[PDB]
Swiss-Prot record:
Gene (name only): RORC
Stated name of the protein: Nuclear receptor ROR-gamma
Portion held of the full protein: 267 to 507 of 518
Subcellular location, record wording: Nucleus
Associated pathology: Immunodeficiency 42: An autosomal recessive primary immunodeficiency characterized by increased susceptibility to concomitant candidiasis and mycobacteriosis. Candidiasis is characterized by persistent and/or recurrent infections of the skin, nails and mucous membranes caused by organisms of the genus Candida. Mycobacteriosis is characterized by infections caused by moderately virulent mycobacterial species, such as Bacillus Calmette-Guerin (BCG) vaccine, environmental non-tuberculous mycobacteria, and by the more virulent Mycobacterium tuberculosis.
Protein family: Belongs to the nuclear hormone receptor family. NR1 subfamily.
Length: 241
């Protein structure tokens, strides 16, 4: 067998070990929807309590993406500068892509704190336009019916992007990128799923949405600093201040 069949297996294993929520659990829980009373309870919470909760969940989500990256063949052999450039630019883009597995397009709900709720759950945060954009992005991705292996290989390429500004060893990132591109393309051909390539989000759209999301998180962190369960000092240092 080729390096490439092994690389598909190792990327998918890295994803399985770090996916955070199991797809089978997410799909089984779709009928478990917050009641009108439970939605009102969330809408009445303080902006600042909803921010603490959401910030904790998002921090956590990012940490699973860091663990995913650490398991990607060659990622740990990149210099620390380049690891941090890639994670800073890509880890929240990966969280936004990972959201589609936890999103039900039939009723426009997301799995949050054990049940599915709509964007109105988050009313107290006063972010309706941005949250609507995040839901809309998941709605767009939901139409692809991404397999678990498609998510794994696609999100590896969201991270391993030799075009990110500020890389010091661009050729080393290019080598990992080309092998992951070949892995993804080989896998789509074998599964008769090449049709998804034309349907993937424009890179500018994911970048713009991620930038808007992180900017809003930065504003909340400035107004109301959180306690972070920090595991990755070089990455923490780049995002928190
Ligand atoms: O364990 C660690 O060391 C560690 C380090 C950093 C982490 N995340 C930083 C976040 C946040 C963010 C979040 Cl998730 C919540 C509240 C406030 C923020 C803020 F914006 F303020 F940074 N948003 O984007 C990123 C990010 C990370 C990579 N690219 C983007 C998470 C855990
Ligand atoms: C869109 C809403 C609100 C965003 C509020 C804002 C703009 C202040 O960050 C966020 C809040 C919590 C987020 C989830 C946290 C954890 C996960 C698990 C991960 O595997 C996939 C993504 C997901 C479901 C996040 C989706 C976006 C959520 C609901």
């Amino acid at each position: 067998l080729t390096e490439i069949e092994h690389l598909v297996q190792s990327v998918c294993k890295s994803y399985r070990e770090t996916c955070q929520l199991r797809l089978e659990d997410l799909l089984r829980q779709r009928s478990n929807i917050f009641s009108r009373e439970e939605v009102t309870g969330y809408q009445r919470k303080s902006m600042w309590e909803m921010w603490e909760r959401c910030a904790h969940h998002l921090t956590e989500a990012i940490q699973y993406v860091v663990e995913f990256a650490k398991r990607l063949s060659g990622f740990m052999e990149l210099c620390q500068n380049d690891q941090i450039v890639l994670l800073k630019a890509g880890a929240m883009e990966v969280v936004l892509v990972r959201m589609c597995r936890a999103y039900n397009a039939d009723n426009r709900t997301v799995f949050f704190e054990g049940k599915y709720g709509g964007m109105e759950l988050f009313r107290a945060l006063g972010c309706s336009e941005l949250i609507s954009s995040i839901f809309d992005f998941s709605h767009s991705l939901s139409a692809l019916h991404f397999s678990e292996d498609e998510i794994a290989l696609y999100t590896a390429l969201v991270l391993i992007n030799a075009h990110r500004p500020g890389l010091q060893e661009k050729r080393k990132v290019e080598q990992l990128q080309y092998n992951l591109e070949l892995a993804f393309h080989h896998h789509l051909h074998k599964t008769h799923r090449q049709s998804i390539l034309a349907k993937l989000p424009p890179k500018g759209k994911l970048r713009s949405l991620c930038s808007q999301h992180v900017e809003r998180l930065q504003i909340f962190q400035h107004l109301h600093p959180i306690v972070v369960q920090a595991a990755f000092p070089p990455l923490y240092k780049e995002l928190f201040s």
